[PDB]
Structures are given as C-alpha cells and as structure tokens.
C-alpha cells in the first residue's frame, strides 16, 4: 500500500518502536538516512542502521535481524521487487519502503497489511488495476484474462526509472513534524542533486524539484535573518545559485574543470589531440589569460571572478553549448567553507565508490556517511580530493576507449568493454561508478561521431568484477539525448535475454539494468540481446 | 580628417616623411588593410589564422613575412628598411587595433603587440657591416657566444621629487643614455631624484654577443 | 667490436653493415649511385619517399602533439621472448642486459 500521510500512519507508529534501517549505498539514500537519523535522535527512537548494496546483502542482513526487529525501513531499495517473496518475513512485521526506484512492483502496491510505501502518490505512477492483475466458455474467458494480464504487466514493467528523491520525501516528513533544520534542508538538496548528477531524472523534473526546494530555502533564510540585521558568520547559509555546470570549479583550476567536465569535454573533444586547441579558442574568446585559467580558482584574480559566470555563458552560447548555466544551491558557513550541491555529491560519491582495498564497502559507506556532517568536514575535503582523482581517471578511460575504438556498434545498441589490467579499470569495477562512466562515455561518443543514426543508439558496457570467479559486471544505458525521459528497458531486456539463453546471471544490484555475468556467457548473452532488441 | 595620399613621392627624408601625421595615418591604414586582406596562394586569410594562433597562446607578438608584405603593399616595403623604428612602431599600433578587433578582450592579456619582420632579403655578412648600414634594418647570421641574464630595463620612468611627494611625469627611456628630469615642475628642486619603483614601467632586457660561425669564413 | 658490455648494452639498436660481394646487388647499388650522381648534378624502396620538408614537419609534429600511451602489449609473449633471448645470448656474443632490452622494445613500440 501507499502511505497517504507520512506523519500519522508512518512516523507516529515507529516513534514508539525499535526500528531497523536498511540503506542503499547511494548519495540520495545517505541523505535520506541522515535526515531520518536526525529525526529519530530528536525523539530518542532506538534505531539500528545497516548498510546494504545488493539483494543478497539485504537478504543476509534481514535473516540476521528478523527475530529482534518488527519494524523495518528500506531506503532506496525494495520497491521494484516482491519483498515478501525475497525476504520471507513473518506476518507481524512491517516494511516501510522509501525507495526512488520505479515502477513499484504490483505485489508491493496491493499488499495492504505488511508492505507500506513511503512514496508520493502524485509521482508519475501508472499502476494497473487490481482486477487486471489478480483473480468451455468460462475457461476461454479465463485464458483471455491471463493473456490480458501478461500483456499489461509487460507494458507496466518494461521501462524502469526514478521518482522523487528519498531525501526530499524525508525532508517533507521533517517539515510536517516541524523539526526541519537547515542541515536537513541541505541534505535534501544534496539528495536531489545526486539524482541530477547521475542523470536519474529529467531536466524538467529537476527544475520542478528545485522550485520546490527554493521555497524551503527562502523560509529557512527568513526564519531568523533579514536584509537589515543578520546571523553570525558561523551559521549555515543556504543560497539558491544559477551557477555553472562545470564540476568542482571552485576547488580546482578552471582549466582542469573545463578539462574534466563531461559536458565541455564531450563538446570540445578534449580526449583528441585537436581538443586542447578548441579549448584555447574558447578561452581566447572569453579573454581569460591562460596563466589565470590554470591557477587555482580561489587564487584567481577577483577582477576575473567578478563576472565569470556571464562570460562563460555568453561564450558557451556562441560556441554551441546552449545550457551551460544550471539552477542549483550552495552552502556557506564560517569564513572559508563554500560548497555547491554538486560538489558535495561528487565528494560523497567518491568517498563511497573509493577504489581503496581497505576494510570493506561498508567501511567506505561509513566514511561517505560521516562526511555529510559538518563535524567531519575533513572527510568532505578528502572526498573532494578523491573526486579529482576519479574524474581524471574517468576522462583517461573515455580517451582510451574512443582512441582505441572499443565502443563499437552491434546493431540496435553500442557495445563497449574494459579489459583486465588496463589503467584504472579497478576504479570502475564497482557497478555504480561503471554506470556513471558509461553515461559520460556515451555522451562523449555521440558528441564525437558524425553518424546521425549512431547518435540515437543506447549503450551496453561491461567491465571485470572477479577474476577468481570469472565474472563481469554489465550495465545498460538509454540513448543520450537532450529530450530523453531517462527511462530504460535494459532491466527486462537483460532478464529476458538471460532466461532465453539459460545464462548464469546474478541479479544482485538494485537497478535492474545492472547485472553480473559469468564471463564466458557473454557471447551468447550479447547475441540474445541483439536478437531481442532486433 | 587627414586625407589619404600617394605615399612614395615627397621632398622630406624618409624618417621625417613617415614621422609626419598625414603619411603616418596613411601607413597605419595600409598596414591595417594588409593584415585584414592578405591571403595565401590557396586563398586562406593568413593573418586571421596567425592572430588566432597568437591569441590562443597569448604570445603577444605577430610575425610578418617581408616577401609578401612587398607583394601586397609596395611602399611599406620601400620605407621599412629605410626608417625601421618609425614604421615598426606604426605597424605595432595597427596590429594592436586589428587584434583588438578580432579579440576585443585581448587588452586584458596585453596592452602592446610587437610586429616581428622575417625573411628580410637584404641579408649581410657579419664582418661586412659598414657605416652604409647605420640606422637601417639588416639581417645577419652568427653563433651566440654570450648572453646576459634577463634584466628589467626602465621604459617609462616616473621620478619622486628629491624633497617632496610629487611624481615627475613619464620619461621614455632610451638605449643611449639614462633620461633624467632636471628639475621638478611643482617646485624647481633639481639634481638627484628617486625612481618610483612601483609606478615605473619596466621591460625585459637581454644583451647577447654574436660572432661569425666557425665554419663560415674563419679559416684560421 | 672492441667495445665493452656497459657501453654496448646502452645502445638500444645494434646495426651491422657488411660490404660483401654479390654481383646482382652490386649492379643495383652501382646503378643507383650513378643515378644519384647524375640526378644531383648542379645543373629496395618500392614505395617512394616523402619530401624532406614534409618529413621535417611530420617529425616535429609527431614528437610534440602525440604522446603514445601503453595499456596492453601481450606481456607473456614479450617475457617469453626476452627469457629465451637471454638463454641463447648466454651461449654467444651479444649482450641483452636484463631490463634495457625489454625497455628498448617498449620504446621502439612507442
Ligand atoms: Zn619637491
């Protein structure tokens, strides 16, 4: 069932109870977890928090914890599968699901007693009616009904996508509880910006949600400040910004940010030998000295920093980059700490997807989660350093793939693969960073090629996972277009291709468009996908 | 305004002629037009490409080929070896305001651009230099034997008055003698003065010694 | 050769040229030399060269605007090659000192 009011029939229920949080390892999940943590700590709710990153891990943790806890909250996981089938719970347990994944599984939708969904009912949802999904001429009519059922269920389950941010949902709950702090609002903003950075949502939906959060920012600012008398410099001040699309440009030199932003790198073809000259054309059009552009931004001359955004916008317009400016937010506190929401997103993501072989992925999750609090600001800066390394490695990998021409058409989709032992393949072994790399690589490819048909294709990308088990991760990306809905069918396509091939596919990740394959299975699996997409 | 002319006929000397306002403006316009209209044998606008390749790298120095300057503008090639300092100053100004037409924000990068002449056909052996070549543009070849370090030389110097706060206005430094104020216009104290080290404009300086290449003519 | 191993091994490429008699090859070489002498009066190729101005531009472009990267070169093949090259050299008279010849091959591939 959908929860109609989070306050009464979710929060006031669990407020009297011991709770278990399962949280996915993504930045939106981390922000929603932080908001809910702060609420529970205000109300002395005895919660336990468990990270998870796949179905096997969630099943293991639930089997470990099922006896002691009756109330469970799943953040950014569980909505798009039958939780009762997967977990096999006792009937007295209750699962709250604040998950952005769409479409919601019909069993979770119509299970009234046990599965409760912390999902907005005014999100883009098209759930089929109950009578269409659940129960001689009567036999013929029944078989016709079953044919209708399979057709409508395939139409419902074909495309997966993402709804409103879980962090935004939790901040809505905090606002209804009248316990919303400025830091909670910042976590909500970072949660939305995670979806925008990873291209999980459309630009229109992102603009709408930014319009929602603008009102909350204005309310929080005018809560205790006006234009006549102001707060201490120590206090956090969140400001709406119509800022630049360039990544981490306030902590870098502008040259590095123009080099490693996927947008500008794809436009100017900076992987190519000619791309640096095109970048120099752009910089000379702006009139910025190269010794200033290659200097760190905080050390750049303030005469140049005065109107840099207008300069970059108006040069980008005539160079063909039509949407260089983006609606976003920034947070200021103290004298010297200034971050964009995209900066916090990249830092936390790099901490979580860090390639270091220390401890465990749960350890990297813990470092990422700690970095979202201002008492652990050093972790945030360290995450920014890791983001520098990650973005440089991303551009190196894209340059390698395009120069050696690993990205190759195979009919209805482009195909690419990373070989073992190549530079910085370890950084993209993990599925989430691989999905991000595939998106950036597809943007670079469609900006590079002259073939108008190839600009319309989706991308399938693979990389090694475990040589000892002989497995590869595989991800599927929809076509990269300006007006895409960011819906993709590769979940069901992978499932149906694997079933039609009897392939050894482990479906452990929460996105259905991310899978693990036994490596030798890839040839017949790819052939099946080619025959399927046709 | 000052009217355009036939340039090559005059009663003055060449230096005096190109110093006068009318022909100076005509020379300026001619070199501007030459930069903005010269083309390659294949029809490529040469100096648009060269100015773009300069402004990309911020090199603030434009190389011009005599062998096509003579092709496009005859009289400029005529006056250039005869009055090089004056004509090169005029070329610098014209090139600067061409570059600020192509890249209007380039004054943020540099306030002055030097025109450098290449492939000058009146080449001279280094030991064959005579009084006949004085104050004329020459081309020579040789091996560099010595170099000073890169040193700052005064170019536009403002002097603090020896007894009060006043800055005596800019003097254009020469390569022949250290220019001096004599006495201050606000109060006629005289003799020694202090350079305003902050407001004075300096330029890079480097003096090299070149001699004939060992294998060219020095046969013992 | 009369050179020692520390100086020989520093040369990545060793070249030997011999003026051995072979009358057909001598005819071809002599005809080419006479052709050069008559061609350049003051007044094995089969592919035609580039003009030397084009070659100078090509070299100076390639040495600055191109930086070849190495990502995979069939490591076991090169290692096996180097190992039995060392084995054969131990019995005879030229000196693949351990890493310099491996790195010579890497440099030549680049
Ligand atoms: Zn005085």
UniProtKB/Swiss-Prot annotation, chain A:
Record localization: Nucleus; Chromosome
Keywords on record: Cell cycle, Chromosome, Disease variant, DNA replication, Dwarfism, Nucleus, Phosphoprotein
A GO CC term attached to the entry: centrosome
Top-level taxonomic group: Eukaryota
Transmembrane segments: none
Residues annotated with Phosphotyrosine modification: 130
Keyword check for Nucleus: yes
Tissue: Widely expressed, highest levels are found in adult testis and thymus and in fetal liver.
PANTHER family: CDC45-RELATED PROTEIN, CELL DIVISION CONTROL PROTEIN 45 HOMOLOG
Oligomer and partners: Component of the CMG helicase complex, a hexameric ring of related MCM2-7 subunits stabilized by CDC45 and the tetrameric GINS complex. Associated with ORC2. Interacts with HELB.
Family, similarity comment: Belongs to the CDC45 family.
Disease: Meier-Gorlin syndrome 7: A form of Meier-Gorlin syndrome, a syndrome characterized by bilateral microtia, aplasia/hypoplasia of the patellae, and severe intrauterine and postnatal growth retardation with short stature and poor weight gain. Additional clinical findings include anomalies of cranial sutures, microcephaly, apparently low-set and simple ears, microstomia, full lips, highly arched or cleft palate, micrognathia, genitourinary tract anomalies, and various skeletal anomalies.
General function of this protein: Required for initiation of chromosomal DNA replication. Core component of CDC45-MCM-GINS (CMG) helicase, the molecular machine that unwinds template DNA during replication, and around which the replisome is built.
Protein name per the record: Cell division control protein 45 homolog
Species this chain originates from: Homo sapiens (Human)
Curated annotation (Swiss-Prot), chain B:
Assigned protein family: Belongs to the MCM family.
Biological role: Acts as a component of the MCM2-7 complex (MCM complex) which is the replicative helicase essential for 'once per cell cycle' DNA replication initiation and elongation in eukaryotic cells. Core component of CDC45-MCM-GINS (CMG) helicase, the molecular machine that unwinds template DNA during replication, and around which the replisome is built.
Domain of life: Eukaryota
Compartments in which it is found: Nucleus; Chromosome
Modifications made to the protein after synthesis: Phosphorylation by the CDC7-DBF4 complex during G1/S phase is required for the initiation of DNA replication.
Residues with the N6-acetyllysine modification: 48
Zinc fingers (C4-type), renumbered ranges: 161-187
Organism taxonomic ancestry: Eukaryota, Metazoa, Chordata, Craniata, Vertebrata
Membrane-crossing segments per the record: none
Cross-link for Glycyl lysine isopeptide (Lys-Gly) (interchain with G-Cter in SUMO2), residue positions: 10
Protein encoded by which gene: MCM2
Full protein stretch here: 169 to 388 of 904
Other comment: Early fractionation of eukaryotic MCM proteins yielded a variety of dimeric, trimeric and tetrameric complexes with unclear biological significance. Specifically a MCM467 subcomplex is shown to have in vitro helicase activity which is inhibited by the MCM2 subunit. The MCM2-7 hexamer is the proposed physiological active complex.
Identification of the protein by name: DNA replication licensing factor MCM2
Annotated source species: Homo sapiens (Human)
Modified residues (Phosphoserine): 213
Subunit structure: Component of the MCM2-7 complex. The complex forms a toroidal hexameric ring with the proposed subunit order MCM2-MCM6-MCM4-MCM7-MCM3-MCM5. Component of the CMG helicase complex, a hexameric ring of related MCM2-7 subunits stabilized by CDC45 and the tetrameric GINS complex. Interacts with DBF4. Interacts with KAT7. May interact with MCM10. Component of the replisome complex composed of at least DONSON, MCM2, MCM7, PCNA and TICRR. Forms a co-chaperone complex with DNAJC9 and histone H3.3-H4 heterodimers.
UniProtKB/Swiss-Prot annotation, chain C:
Motif (Arginine finger): 9-12
Post-translation changes: Phosphorylation by the CDC7-DBF4 complex during G1/S phase is required for the initiation of DNA replication.
Compartments (UniProt record): Nucleus; Chromosome
Top-level taxon of origin: Eukaryota
Note: Early fractionation of eukaryotic MCM proteins yielded a variety of dimeric, trimeric and tetrameric complexes with unclear biological significance. Specifically a MCM467 subcomplex is shown to have in vitro helicase activity which is inhibited by the MCM2 subunit. The MCM2-7 hexamer is the proposed physiological active complex.
Assigned protein family: Belongs to the MCM family.
Disease annotated for this entry: Deafness, autosomal dominant, 70: A form of non-syndromic sensorineural hearing loss. Sensorineural deafness results from damage to the neural receptors of the inner ear, the nerve pathways to the brain, or the area of the brain that receives sound information. DFNA70 is characterized by slowly progressive, postlingual hearing impairment.
Whole sequence portion shown: 647 to 775 of 904
UniProt-recorded name of the protein: DNA replication licensing factor MCM2
Organism listed in the record: Homo sapiens
Role this protein plays: Acts as a component of the MCM2-7 complex (MCM complex) which is the replicative helicase essential for 'once per cell cycle' DNA replication initiation and elongation in eukaryotic cells. Core component of CDC45-MCM-GINS (CMG) helicase, the molecular machine that unwinds template DNA during replication, and around which the replisome is built.
Recorded name of the encoding gene: MCM2
């Amino acid at each position: 069932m959908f929860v109609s009011d989070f306050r009464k029939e979710f929060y006031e229920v669990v407020q009297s109870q011991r709770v278990l949080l399962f949280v996915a390892s993504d930045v939106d999940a981390l922000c929603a977890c932080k908001i809910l943590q702060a609420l529970f700590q205000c109300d002395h709710v005895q919660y336990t928090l468990v990270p998870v990153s796949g179905w096997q891990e969630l099943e293991t943790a639930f089997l470990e914890h099922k006896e002691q806890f009756h109330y469970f909250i799943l953040i950014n996981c569980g909505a798009n599968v039958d939780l009762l089938d997967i977990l096999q719970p006792d009937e007295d347990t209750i699962f709250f699901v604040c998950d952005t994944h769409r479409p919601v599984n019909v069993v979770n939708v119509y299970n009234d007693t046990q599965i409760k969904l912390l999902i907005k009912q005014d999100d883009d949802l098209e759930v089929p009616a109950y009578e269409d999904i659940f129960r001689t001429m009567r036999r013929r009519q029944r078989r016709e009904w079953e044919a209708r059922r399979r057709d409508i269920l395939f139409d419902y389950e074909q495309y997966e996508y993402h709804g409103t941010s879980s962090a935004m949902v939790m901040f809505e709950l905090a606002w209804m509880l009248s316990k919303d702090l400025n830091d909670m609002l910042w976590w909500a903003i970072v949660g939305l910006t995670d979806q925008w950075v990873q291209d999980k949502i459309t630009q229109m939906k992102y603009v709408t949600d930014v319009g929602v959060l603008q009102r909350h920012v204005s309310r929080h600012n005018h809560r205790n400040e006006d234009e006549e008398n102001t707060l201490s410099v120590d206090c956090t001040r969140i400001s709406f910004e119509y800022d630049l699309r360039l990544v981490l440009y306030q902590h870098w030199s502008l040259h590095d940010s123009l080099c490693n932003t996927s947008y500008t790198a794809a436009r100017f073809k900076l992987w190519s030998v000619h791309g640096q000259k095109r970048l120099q054309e752009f910089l000379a059009d702006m009139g910025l000295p190269l010794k200033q552009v290659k200097q760190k931004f905080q050390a750049m001359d303030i005469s140049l920093k005065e109107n840099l955004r207008e300069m970059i916008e108006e040069s980008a317009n005539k160079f063909g980059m039509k949407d260089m400016r983006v609606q976003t937010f920034s947070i200021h506190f103290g004298f010297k700490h200034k971050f964009l929401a995209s900066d916090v997103v990249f830092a936390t993501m790099s901490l979580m997807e860090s390639p270091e072989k220390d401890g465990s992925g749960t350890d990297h999750f813990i470092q990422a989660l700690d970095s979202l609090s201002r008492s652990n600001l050093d972790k945030l800066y360290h995450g920014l350093e890791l983001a520098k390394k990650q973005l440089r490695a991303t551009q190196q990998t894209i340059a390698s793939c395009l120069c050696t021409n690993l990205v190759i058409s195979q009919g209805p989709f482009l195909y690419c693969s990373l070989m073992e032992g190549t530079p910085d393949v370890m950084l993209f072994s993990r599925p989430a960073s691989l999905s991000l790399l595939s998106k950036h690589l597809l943007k670079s490819f469609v900006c590079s090629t002259k073939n108008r048909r190839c600009k319309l294709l989706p991308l399938v990308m693979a990389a090694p996972l475990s040589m000892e088990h002989g497995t590869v991760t595989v991800v599927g990306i929809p076509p990269e277009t300006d007006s895409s809905d960011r819906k993709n069918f590769f979940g069901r396509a992978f499932e149906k291709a694997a079933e039609s091939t009897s392939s050894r596919m482990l479906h452990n990740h929460f996105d259905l468009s991310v899978i693990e394959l036994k490596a030798e299975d890839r040839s017949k699996f790819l052939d099946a996908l080619i025959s399927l997409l046709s | 305004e000052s009217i355009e002319n036939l340039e090559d006929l005059k009663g003055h000397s060449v230096r005096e002629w190109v110093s006068m306002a009318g022909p100076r403006l005509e020379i300026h316009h001619r070199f501007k037009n030459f930069l903005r209209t010269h083309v390659d044998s294949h029809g490529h606008n040469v100096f648009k490409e060269r100015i773009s390749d300069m402004c990309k790298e911020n090199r603030e120095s434009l190389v011009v080929n005599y062998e096509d300057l003579a092709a496009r503008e005859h009289v400029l090639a005529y006056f250039l070896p005869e009055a090089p300092a004056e004509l090169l100053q005029i070329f610098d100004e014209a090139a600067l305001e061409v570059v600020l037409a192509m890249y209007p924000k380039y004054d943020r990068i540099t306030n002055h651009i030097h025109v450098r002449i290449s492939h000058l056909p009146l080449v001279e052996e280094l030991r064959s230099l005579r009084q006949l070549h004085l104050n004329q543009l020459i081309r020579t070849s040789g091996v560099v034997t010595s170099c000073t370090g890169v040193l700052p030389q005064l170019s536009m110097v403002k002097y603090n008055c020896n007894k009060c706060n006043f800055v005596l206005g800019p003097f254009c430094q020469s390569q022949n003698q250290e220019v001096k104020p004599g006495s201050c216009p606000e109060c006629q104290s005289a003799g020694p003065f202090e350079v305003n080290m902050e407001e004075t404009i300096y330029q890079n300086y480097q003096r090299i010694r070149i001699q004939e290449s060992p294998g060219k003519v020095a046969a013992g | 050769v009369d050179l020692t191993e520390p100086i020989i091994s520093r040369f990545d490429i060793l070249c030997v040229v011999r003026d051995t008699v072979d009358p057909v090859q001598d005819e071809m070489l002599a005809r080419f030399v006479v052709g050069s002498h008559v061609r350049h009066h003051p007044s094995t190729y089969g592919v035609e060269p580039l003009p030397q101005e084009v070659l100078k531009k090509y070299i100076i472009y390639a040495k600055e605007r191109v930086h070849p990267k190495l990502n995979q070169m069939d490591q076991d093949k090169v290692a096996k090659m180097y190992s039995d090259l060392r084995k054969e050299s131990m019995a005879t008279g030229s000196i693949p000192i351990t890493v310099r010849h491996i790195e010579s091959m890497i440099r030549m591939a680049e």
